[PDB]
Amino acid sequence: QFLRTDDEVVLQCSATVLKEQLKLCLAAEGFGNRLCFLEPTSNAQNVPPDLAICCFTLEQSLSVRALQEMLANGHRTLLYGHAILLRHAHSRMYLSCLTTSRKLAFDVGLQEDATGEACWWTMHPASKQRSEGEKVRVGDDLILVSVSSERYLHLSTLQVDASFMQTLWNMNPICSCCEEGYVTGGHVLRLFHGECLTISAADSDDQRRLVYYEGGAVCTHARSLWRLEPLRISWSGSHLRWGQPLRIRHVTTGRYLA
Amino acid sequence: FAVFVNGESVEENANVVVRLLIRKPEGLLAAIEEAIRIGHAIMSFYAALIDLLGRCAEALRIRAILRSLLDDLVGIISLPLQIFVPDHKASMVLFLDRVYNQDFLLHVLVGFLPDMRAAASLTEMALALNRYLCLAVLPLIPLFAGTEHRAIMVDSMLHTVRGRSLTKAQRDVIEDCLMARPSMLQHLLRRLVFDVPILNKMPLKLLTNHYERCWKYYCLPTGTSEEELHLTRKLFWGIFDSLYDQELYRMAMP
Amino acid sequence: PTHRACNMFLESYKAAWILTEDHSFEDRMIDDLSKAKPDPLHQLVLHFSRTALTEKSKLDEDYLYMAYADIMAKSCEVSFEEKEMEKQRLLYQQSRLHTRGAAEMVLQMISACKGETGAMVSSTLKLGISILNGGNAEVQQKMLDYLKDKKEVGFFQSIQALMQTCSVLDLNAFERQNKDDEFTQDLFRFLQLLCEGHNNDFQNYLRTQTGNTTTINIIICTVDYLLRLQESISDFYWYYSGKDVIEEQGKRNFSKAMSVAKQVFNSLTEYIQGPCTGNQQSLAHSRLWDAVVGFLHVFAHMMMKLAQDSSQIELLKELLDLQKDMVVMLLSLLEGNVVNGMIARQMVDMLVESSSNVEMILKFFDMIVGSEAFQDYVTDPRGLISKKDFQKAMDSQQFTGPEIQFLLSCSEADENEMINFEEFANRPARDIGFNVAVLLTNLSEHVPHDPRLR
Numbered sequence: 001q002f003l004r005t006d007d008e009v010v011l012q013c014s015a016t017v018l019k020e021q022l023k024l025c026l027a028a029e030g031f032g033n034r035l036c037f038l039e040p041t042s043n044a045q046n047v048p049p050d051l052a053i054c055c056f057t058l059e060q061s062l063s064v065r066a067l068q069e070m071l072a073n074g075h076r077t078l079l080y081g082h083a084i085l086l087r088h089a090h091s092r093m094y095l096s097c098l099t100t101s102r103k104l105a106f107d108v109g110l111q112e113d114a115t116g117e118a119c120w121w122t123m124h125p126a127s128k129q130r131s132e133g134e135k136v137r138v139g140d141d142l143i144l145v146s147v148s149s150e151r152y153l154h155l156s157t158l159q160v161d162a163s164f165m166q167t168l169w170n171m172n173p174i175c176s177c178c179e180e181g182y183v184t185g186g187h188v189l190r191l192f193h194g195e196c197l198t199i200s201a202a203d204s205d206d207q208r209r210l211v212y213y214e215g216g217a218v219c220t221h222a223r224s225l226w227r228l229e230p231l232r233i234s235w236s237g238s239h240l241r242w243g244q245p246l247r248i249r250h251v252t253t254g255r256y257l258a
Numbered sequence: 259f260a261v262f263v264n265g266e267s268v269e270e271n272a273n274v275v276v277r278l279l280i281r282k283p284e285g286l287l288a289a290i291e292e293a294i295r296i297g298h299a300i301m302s303f304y305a306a307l308i309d310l311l312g313r314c315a316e317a318l319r320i321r322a323i324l325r326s327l328l329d330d331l332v333g334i335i336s337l338p339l340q341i342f343v344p345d346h347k348a349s350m351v352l353f354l355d356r357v358y359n360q361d362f363l364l365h366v367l368v369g370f371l372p373d374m375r376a377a378a379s380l381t382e383m384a385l386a387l388n389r390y391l392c393l394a395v396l397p398l399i400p401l402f403a404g405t406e407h408r409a410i411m412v413d414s415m416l417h418t419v420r421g422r423s424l425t426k427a428q429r430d431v432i433e434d435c436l437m438a439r440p441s442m443l444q445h446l447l448r449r450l451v452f453d454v455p456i457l458n459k460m461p462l463k464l465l466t467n468h469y470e471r472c473w474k475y476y477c478l479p480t481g482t483s484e485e486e487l488h489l490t491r492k493l494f495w496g497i498f499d500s501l502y503d504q505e506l507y508r509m510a511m512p
Numbered sequence: 513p514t515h516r517a518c519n520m521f522l523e524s525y526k527a528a529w530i531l532t533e534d535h536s537f538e539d540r541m542i543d544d545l546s547k548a549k550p551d552p553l554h555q556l557v558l559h560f561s562r563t564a565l566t567e568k569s570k571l572d573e574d575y576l577y578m579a580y581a582d583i584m585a586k587s588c589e590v591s592f593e594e595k596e597m598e599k600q601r602l603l604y605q606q607s608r609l610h611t612r613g614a615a616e617m618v619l620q621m622i623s624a625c626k627g628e629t630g631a632m633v634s635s636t637l638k639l640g641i642s643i644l645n646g647g648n649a650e651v652q653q654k655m656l657d658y659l660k661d662k663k664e665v666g667f668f669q670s671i672q673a674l675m676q677t678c679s680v681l682d683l684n685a686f687e688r689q690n691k692d693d694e695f696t697q698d699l700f701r702f703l704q705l706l707c708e709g710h711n712n713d714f715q716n717y718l719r720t721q722t723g724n725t726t727t728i729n730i731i732i733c734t735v736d737y738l739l740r741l742q743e744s745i746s747d748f749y750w751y752y753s754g755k756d757v758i759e760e761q762g763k764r765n766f767s768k769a770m771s772v773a774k775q776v777f778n779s780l781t782e783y784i785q786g787p788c789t790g791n792q793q794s795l796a797h798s799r800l801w802d803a804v805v806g807f808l809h810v811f812a813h814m815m816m817k818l819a820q821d822s823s824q825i826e827l828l829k830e831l832l833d834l835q836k837d838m839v840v841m842l843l844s845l846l847e848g849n850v851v852n853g854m855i856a857r858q859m860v861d862m863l864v865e866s867s868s869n870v871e872m873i874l875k876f877f878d879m880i881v882g883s884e885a886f887q888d889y890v891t892d893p894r895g896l897i898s899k900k901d902f903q904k905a906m907d908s909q910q911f912t913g914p915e916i917q918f919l920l921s922c923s924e925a926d927e928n929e930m931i932n933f934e935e936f937a938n939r940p941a942r943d944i945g946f947n948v949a950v951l952l953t954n955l956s957e958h959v960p961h962d963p964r965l966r
Binding site: 063064065066069072074077081132134135 | 751
């Protein structure tokens with residue numbers, strides 16, 4: 001119920017841009033573009049979010065001074081004071097405050113290592129209720145602050161970047177861990193026929209939209225893969241259960257089967 | 259006063275102070291000229307600000323977040339271009355020194371130029387000239403362009419001839435010797451040979467002593483204008499004709 | 513200098529011969545007021561009892577009350593035979609401020625002390641402890657009687673907030689200090705002495721105090737001080753964790769915190785040493801379990817880190833006194849329990865959540881391996897053996913190998929490369945591990961078949 005080590009999580013944030021009540025994922029592919037960008041979530045219906053990328057596994061939650069010591073060299077609950085490492089679910093490159101203007105404040109973006117001050121981020125709650133040492137409640141206000149520059153993680157007008165101005169980031173966990181042999185949501189897997197589900201190879205006249213069963217060849221190939229997306233921004237990582245909504249993003253296409 | 263203490267910052271305060279100053283009281287160059295045209299005390303505010311930021315410096319990290327604000331870069335020149343002003347420039351310089359390569363000297367300038375006005379001691383600029391002499395204390399740290407700018411700074415050495423700050427300018431001259439084309443420095447040294455003609459003012463003879471250690475470094479170069487230097491040597495014999503301070507001056511003459 | 517020499521003599525002599533034993537007068541003074549429609553000392557307290565109930569909002573500093581509080585504060589088998597003779601004379605004196613109304617004033621003044629930490633309040637505690645000290649129930653009964661009477665709220669309303677500031681080691685100050693908690697240590701002993709001798713009627717009073725329309729809960733708050741202390745001590749660890757050898761002021765300042773910590777666990781015990789199960793039920797839901805976790809993290813590492821040389825041992829002996837009592841609350845947070853009792857199962861939980869932390873403490877107890885080892889290879893008339901020979905000796909007679917290197921470092925490295933056995937038996941330390949072994953049995957005996965515990 002409280003945020004913890006190895007909890008898959010995303011920075012939901014919040015905004016009321018124009019009139020739309022625009023909550024959004026913070027994400028980047030990492031590969032091919034290490035700079036982070038918005039993945040809007042207020043329209044979690046007709047135009048579904050790229051959930052695959054926004055996921056950020058937690059790694060360690062050292063105390064401020066403790067973190068400073070680790071530089072000089074267990075599903076722990078988070079506390080409002082520790083800095084936290086933030087692994088990308090995909091590229092696995094850890095989150096950081098990279099130095100680039102876009103106003104005068106550093107752009108968010110990935111590293112390639114646990115090492116370095118950039119990786120880490122203190123969590124200061126804003127609310128008078130919340131304070132240090134409290135087990136970190138799900139969905140409570142929290143303000144990431146890069147240890148590397150001690151800018152707040154700001155949502156600039158839209159693109160994210162660290163800045164001395166605050167932004168009220170919010171963070172709903174995807175799931176804790178997983179029980180082995182059982183399907184969590186947000187997971188990517190093949191659907192065996194008992195042989196497996198598939199699509200056509202690229203540069204088919206179909207625009208690769210035709211759907212097939214197939215055996216051989218593809219069963220090892222990437223096009224055989226299928227990412228399940230249970231239909232919630234928040235606890236999408238919950239163990240899969242039949243009879244709940246879930247669009248099936250195809251992997252290689254990135255398209256939803258429909 | 260809270261952080262600068264005797265000199266180098268009490269960083270234990272300064273870190274926290276800068277952290278607070280970063281977070282709230284937020285074009286910071288054109289605004290300088292905008293103020294100069296026109297109010298002014300706001301310019302004194304930004305100058306006090308930069309002076310404040312300059313009085314503090316993992317701390318190399320904090321130095322970097324302060325580096326977020328080389329944005330001024332040639333604000334020293336901008337402040338200089340304003341010549342009611344000099345204080346601001348002093349702030350810019352202290353910040354420039356604490357936060358921030360001999361190349362840079364060419365475009366530090368033109369405060370030595372302004373000193374030419376100061377040599378004639380007879381708006382707020384006359385009241386302000388003292389601050390400019392104070393500025394002379396501050397620095398103390400292709401090559402032909404450097405020979406030109408060094409010709410100019412050497413002209414400032416001529417300007418040097420307050421009096422304790424002038425002794426700091428003498429330190430600028432001895433720094434001009436110890437830091438170091440060399441031959442153009444020998445030309446300014448010819449200017450110091452005419453200064454030697456003036457000598458035999460005794461402080462200008464001390465300038466001839468720094469010119470004597472420069473003559474030693476030049477002797478290393480020696481082991482043209484050098485004939486003029488020989489004229490300076492016979493002029494030194496005239497200094498022998500001129501006769502305590504004279505003794506040490508005689509040693510430098512040797 | 514002439515006159516300046518005069519004044520300096522005014523200072524140093526005051527620092528010198530003025531600071532002496534004539535100040536021991538007070539029994540002569542308090543007896544004088546005890547003579548012979550109330551006796552004067554009773555008159556005296558009744559005055560401050562008036563004065564405290566004046567509506568000052570901001571209670572005034574009072575240089576008169578401050579004095580008499582200290583006056584009264586210092587009013588307090590054959591060894592046992594005079595012990596009772598001391599304890600009687602103590603009890604005769606403790607009653608002297610008790611039959612007289614002072615029992616009430618202390619508690620009253622504090623209600624007026626409210627948010628203040630203003631010195632005078634510190635002196636009141638010094639009286640409020642001295643009245644008790646031995647746990648003198650008679651006061652402790654009366655001191656309760658006063659509170660369910662007035663139902664004043666402002667008593668605890670004082671104490672709650674009083675602890676919210678109170679004091680902490682707080683590291684940031686330390687670096688600055690490099691180049692107050694005695695009052696906190698005092699107060700928790702005050703709260704302790706309200707619960708010395710297990711007053712379940714009173715111990716519950718701290719849980720909730722039904723008579724007050726407000727319901728402050730001291731316990732969850734007195735834990736918050738502990739958790740608040742925890743952050744510092746834990747942070748205090750990491751700061752020296754890279755520095756290996758510790759600053760004397762750091763070695764000292766830490767001990768000052770341990771003196772406070774040692775006291776606070778005692779209060780937690782007195783809120784729970786009585787089998788007042790509802791008090792501990794409150795504490796069971798407390799973040800104290802997290803508080804427990806962290807000290808072990810301290811203890812997991814600070815302990816071994818202290819375990820390097822003789823200069824540390826003094827402080828290391830101090831920390832062991834801390835951990836000793838720390839399980840004593842944790843043991844007592846159990847003493848009355850069903851087999852699969854909820855309160856026990858929660859400490860079943862902590863040991864697993866603090867897995868590595870509790871692991872490390874145990875490895876310290878391997879220490880006989882604290883004695884027999886050298887006999888297999890000793891040779892050179894002083895109990896010496898070379899650290900390498902001591903390393904080769906440990907390959908057999910089998911302690912784990914990574915730990916083996918630690919024993920050399922935990923030794924002394926005395927005289928270039930040789931090590932005494934008898935000096936290398938200090939760690940004293942045994943009392944914790946007794947209590948741990950008690951506790952770990954106490955768990956298995958109360959809660960079995962929970963394999964992660966097993």
